[PDB]
């Protein structure tokens, strides 16, 4: 009576699932409209992560592993903000690897030409300790 | 006349290409696939028939046969064939020492005007130790080819004919892995 099934465990869409829009802002689903549209809201204190309450097309969105546990359905902006601060969505999103890639990307894009000359010089110094280590092993 | 043979055209080659070989499987023993002979003549045979269902059982069929002379076949060369999306192709061919006289006059056209230096720097390559190339060439046959045909000729010097020019064809070795049929070759 042993069953070994290796299938794909996708992420549910549900009330409480927070999702990522393309502008870098998060929103918590509070009621599902159709198979293609849900209505969501992000009450984050961060100006970069805030999202107005409204319809989010799921094609434009991306499902994140974070989920609010017992978010009531159709909860108004105050009630989602209460669950937002209690569960700490912003802290969990910063730990999420998707945000580190975003923060790496933004810091890379803000590099000026003179700070680009550091990195060319600076990776060269780091690379030199890499090669005597690589030649050792 | 049959449409499968018309339009009628002369054979562009006197010997005639075999055009088809039996299919090869490794499980059989190593053996060759063809030989050349010389049409000497034809005679009469009486035979004790033992064919079931035949009213001529245990009786004397009179039949006509042909006598095809077959001189011992001197083996001179080996060829290996590699498989390509544009069909089969020659990857390489290899020969031996001491190539006999009548096989060069096939390689030539005017024996008497020309002088005898066919296969000279090839035999010099065999004697002056480029053996790594023959080690390269024989192993190249082992590793890559999938069809190996041997190169051998008949000898006029044994058979009663007024010619002296030899006759070359390629004869396959089937029945084995690619490793076995080259060491035999």
């Amino acid at each position: 009576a042993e069953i070994n099934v290796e299938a794909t465990s996708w992420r549910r869409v549900e009330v409480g699932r927070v999702l990522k829009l393309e502008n870098g802002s998060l929103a918590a689903i509070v009621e599902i409209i159709d198979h293609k549209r849900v209505l969501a809201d992000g009450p984050s204190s961060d100006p970069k992560l805030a999202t107005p309450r409204g319809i989010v097309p799921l094609s434009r969105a991306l499902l994140t592993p974070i989920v609010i546990p017992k978010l009531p359905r159709g909860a108004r902006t105050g009630a989602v903000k209460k669950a937002w601060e209690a569960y700490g969505v912003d802290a969990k999103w910063k730990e999420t690897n998707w945000a580190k890639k975003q923060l790496q990307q933004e810091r890379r894009q803000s590099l000026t030409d003179f700070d680009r000359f550091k990195v060319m010089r600076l990776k060269k110094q780091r690379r030199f300790e890499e090669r005597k280590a690589l030649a050792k092993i | 006349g049959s449409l499968a043979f018309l339009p009628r055209k002369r054979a562009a080659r006197h010997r005639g290409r075999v055009k088809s070989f039996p299919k090869d499987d490794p499980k059989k023993p190593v053996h060759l696939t063809a030989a050349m002979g010389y049409k000497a003549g034809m005679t009469t045979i009486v035979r004790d028939l033992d064919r079931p269902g035949a009213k001529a059982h245990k009786k004397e069929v009179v039949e006509a046969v042909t006598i095809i002379d077959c001189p011992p076949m001197v083996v001179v060369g080996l060829v290996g064939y590699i498989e390509t999306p544009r069909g089969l192709r020659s990857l390489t061919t290899v020969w031996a020492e001491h190539l006999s006289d009548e096989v060069k006059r096939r390689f030539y056209k005017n024996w008497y005007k020309s002088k005898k230096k066919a296969f000279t720097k090839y035999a010099k390559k065999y004697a002056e130790n480029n053996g790594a190339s023959i080690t390269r060439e024989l192993e190249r046959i082992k590793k890559y080819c999938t069809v190996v045909r041997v190169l051998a000729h008949t000898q006029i010097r044994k058979t009663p004919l007024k010619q002296k020019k030899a006759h070359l064809m390629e004869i396959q070795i089937n029945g084995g892995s690619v490793a076995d049929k080259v060491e035999f070759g």
């Binding site: 790496q104 810091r107 890379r108 990195v119 600076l122 780091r126 280590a133 092993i137 | 999306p85």
Partner: protein
Amino acid sequence: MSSFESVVVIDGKGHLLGRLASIVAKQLLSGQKIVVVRCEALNISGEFFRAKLKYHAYLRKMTRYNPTRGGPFHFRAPSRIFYKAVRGMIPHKTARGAAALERLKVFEGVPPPYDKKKKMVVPQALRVLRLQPGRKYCTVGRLSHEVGWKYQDVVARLEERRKAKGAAYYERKKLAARQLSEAKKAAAAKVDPKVSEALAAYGY
């Protein structure tokens, strides 16, 4: 994102025929050299038998074809089925059109120049990105094999050999991935950590 390459090699597996042909023909006219490998692994949408009528329909509307250049010749290999697609998308009666086809170079399987090189993919012509999941599709290899292509088992066996060589390539790349990651961890203790934070504050 609109980068100019010397030659770009397109893997043909899982790519739709005419969408790959339309993208390739625009790059050839723009001045890009194209090499297509695995033309036997291309895909044509719809069931196999729908591909059979349009093969029979093309031979219908042409009285007295040339046996060597056209007619059923074009369907007798997968490489030249694709070449027939790109040629109808390019002004072949102009010298600009002839020049664009000389930039193209199509193959069945992966020849030895191009198995050591990098094979890219075209997202806008991928079958699994453009076709609905329930829709049925055919392979151009089995289209040409049922027309008269003779080397389907040939290109198969050379490809299963190429996988075996590729298996040894990863096993060498595995060991390089161990040593590179180990050397990164090993030299990080003596990496002068005034400068390690400098790279982290710059994105590297």
